[PDB]
Amino acid sequence: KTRKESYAIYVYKVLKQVHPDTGISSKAMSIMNSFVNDVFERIAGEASRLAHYNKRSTITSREIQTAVRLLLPGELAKHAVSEGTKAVTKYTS
Amino acid sequence: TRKESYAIYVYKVLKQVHPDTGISSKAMSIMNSFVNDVFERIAGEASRLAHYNKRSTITSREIQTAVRLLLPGELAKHAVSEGTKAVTKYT
Amino acid sequence: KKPHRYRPGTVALREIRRYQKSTELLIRKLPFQRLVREIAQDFKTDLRFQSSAVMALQEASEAYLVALFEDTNLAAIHAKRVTIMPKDIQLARRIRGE
Amino acid sequence: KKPHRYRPGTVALREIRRYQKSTELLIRKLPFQRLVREIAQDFKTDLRFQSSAVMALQEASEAYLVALFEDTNLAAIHAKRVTIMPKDIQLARRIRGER
Amino acid sequence: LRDNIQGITKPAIRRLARRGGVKRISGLIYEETRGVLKVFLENVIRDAVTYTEHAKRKTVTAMDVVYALKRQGRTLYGF
Amino acid sequence: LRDNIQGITKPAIRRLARRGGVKRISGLIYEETRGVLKVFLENVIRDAVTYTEHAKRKTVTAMDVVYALKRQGRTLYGF
Amino acid sequence: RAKAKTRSSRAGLQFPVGRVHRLLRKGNYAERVGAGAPVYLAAVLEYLTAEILELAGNAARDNKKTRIIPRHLQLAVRNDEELNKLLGRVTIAQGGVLPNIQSVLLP
DNA sequence: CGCGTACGTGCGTTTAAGCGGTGCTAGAGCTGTCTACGACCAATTGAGCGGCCTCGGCACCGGGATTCTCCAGGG
DNA sequence: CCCTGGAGAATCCCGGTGCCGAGGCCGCTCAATTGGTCGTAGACAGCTCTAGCACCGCTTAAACGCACGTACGCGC
């Protein structure tokens, strides 16, 4: 039927990459899909919000870097920044 | 450069309802921030409303739905009626 | 022959422990379903709700009331009490801005 | 002879009526301004603040503290008291969700 | 549909407070909790009504309830 | 810059309580109010720091503080 | 053309970079979306996903369960202080609350 | 209802907040410049998801038990 | 009146069933991927000039401190 975009399998591979002996129910899967989408809307909304104030038309990696610093607090922020910085350097290389 | 402001339009509104009083620039900045803050809230809700039903456009119904979602109680039906009257007068 | 006669408070704490580690829905389904339809019929008649639509409403209302009860209970010990009052809820909503 | 000797609370009510109708800022500009700089020094060593930038932070902090004091005061009468307590603020932030 | 505010029974309100760690529950709490729940339901459902009216739909979906809860800072996961 | 948390003096905290309708002010409330103010400032100013850093600027503007307060649901009118 | 290598594997990531980029373009955020913005978004989402699931897996072993069910996700979010502040305004269905009792409440 | 202390009230004294002034430069707009970058267009292609097969983890049902809790007896 | 032994009941550990939702597999198809091509936002370089930073008089209302007692937090 109609293909609905979801992060059902993507969370599953993340779970097995850090915990290859546990599973996850569909109700917990839907919570994770809602959790990913809400954080996606918050950061992309913030990144769009940041670009409008600087009169900038594009959203770069620095837009996301500032967005996750504003939303995620403290130690959770800098690991996400470090993980984000590592991903961009690996992608460019 | 030129900076966008809502100062003069509010002044004509102020003289329309109360021509015997003025306004200060310090209060003007508060009202300018007030109109701007409501502007992003309604447009943000209307943009979110269009994204929910996969709508690529924002109509008068998009603004009307955002008003009743944001403005509570009897304040909302005034803005709905005021918006409806302006829409009918527009056509 | 003597009845057990549990003193008040111990079984209440037992109910606290048995219901904090559990995840079943405390409010029954149809009584919450019928309350939604009566409230919605004041806004618009001939309105229907999906089964999962009420499911979203029921869990959100319970969690909001549980969190309100947590602040309501926290006000009781703050007021040197263990029994919650209707004025405790009114203070809780006022501080939250509701 | 004796002075007027206002009872405890009488001058407090006069200060309540005066500051609830006057919009002058209670916190002094310079001691609050230097508090911004030492807080921002932990995030950026070479940072500057505009006069209006410190101005906007002061009013938001004053209104937040006034709103916090309103919730703190209301918890006192709720707890059969007229004196605000540090546990009342801790209750106020937790109910508001600000820990 | 009348007298449906009593559907939230006193043990149900008792059970809700037990989840919140409430030691003792007064007899006047149940009437107040019903009123608070009625006020909270009157805001979420009305917001969901406008969401359903905007979509030209006659049945309120779970997604509209999520958006009604999300706009007031009470976002819900799992639906 | 050290010991600047004491810049919020005792009458200044007392004046803030009087604006909030507080009748009696405890002697231990000044350390708690300073701690609450320090925590609140450590969030908004840090948020404005990231706003200033992202804007390719080395001076914090009031405009950046406006969005820093707005993103936490504390929007300020009058800048 | 060349081999259709996914951008997630190029960046060493599991979350879809293309889906994030597609949702950023159609999500009505900006006129243009940069190249590294979906890569940064995928890394942040994956790290947040991995952090909670590891804590949920830790909570699952506490009650001896091999399947993640919504009580575990709620327990993982509230126990972590940063996840508590990040999701303070977030309601989790079928999760309940933390089983904590007031000190004066015990006999 | 009783205790007491600790916070309201009041000035002495001090001390820095603020107004006004002067000088410097830190740097944000402003204007060119030139340059890679992403939306869009052909062209394509490979694993996500609907669906189907399989299978095993914990709900259910009891069985048993440590195990924590209250009532009664003794000092 | 407080300390300690024994037993009633809700709760916790454990063996057996199984079943229905979770895990795994097959297409395959539509959205993710590859290459090119420009308009164009953006990084970079020089000017500047308007507002912030640092120090200085001063004076004066704001603030620290001490003496006293009565409204009030707290114990019972």
Residue numbers in the entry:
A (entry chain R): 28 to 120
B (entry chain V): 29 to 119
C (entry chain S): 36 to 133
D (entry chain O): 36 to 134
E (entry chain T), F (entry chain P): 22 to 100
G (entry chain Q): 11 to 117
What does the original paper state about this entry?
To understand how these nucleosomal features impact Rpd3S binding to the NCP, we reconstituted an NCP with two extra 20 bp DNA linkers flanking the Widom 601 sequence (187 bp) and an MLA at the lysine-36 position of the H3 histone to mimic a tri-methylated lysine (H3K36MLA). 3D classification of the Rpd3S–NCP187bp/MLA complex results in one overall conformation containing three classes, in which the Rpd3S broadly engages the NCP at the SHL + 2 position with slightly different local positionings. Further local refinement of Rpd3S and NCP density allowed us to obtain high-resolution maps of Rpd3S–NCP187bp/MLA complex with the Rpd3S complex at 2.8–3.1 Å and NCP at 2.6–2.7 Å resolution. We rationalize that the local differential positionings of Rpd3S were due to the absence of an acetylated histone substrate and that the plasticity allows the HDAC to sample H3/H4 histone tails with different modifications. We named the 3D classes of Rpd3S–NCP187bp/MLA at the SHL + 2 positions collectively as the H3/H4 deacetylation states of the Rpd3S–NCP complex, and we termed the K9Q-locked class as the H3K9 deacetylation state. Within the H3/H4 deacetylation states, the active site of Rpd3 exhibits positional shifts of approximately 10–15 Å. Notably, weak density from a putatively unmodified histone tail can be observed near the Rpd3 active site in these H3/H4 deacetylation states. This supports the hypothesis that Rpd3S can sample histone tails at the SHL + 2 position for deacetylation in the absence of the H3K9Q substrate mimic. In all H3/H4 and the locked H3K9 deacetylation states, Rpd3S binds to SHL + 2 of the NCP via a conserved Sin3 basic surface while the MRGA-PHDA arm binds to the phosphodiester backbone of the exiting DNA linker via Rco1A K320/K321/K328. We propose that the H3/H4 and H3K9 deacetylation states capture snapshots of Rpd3S being in the process of sampling and targeting acetylated H3/H4 on the nucleosome.
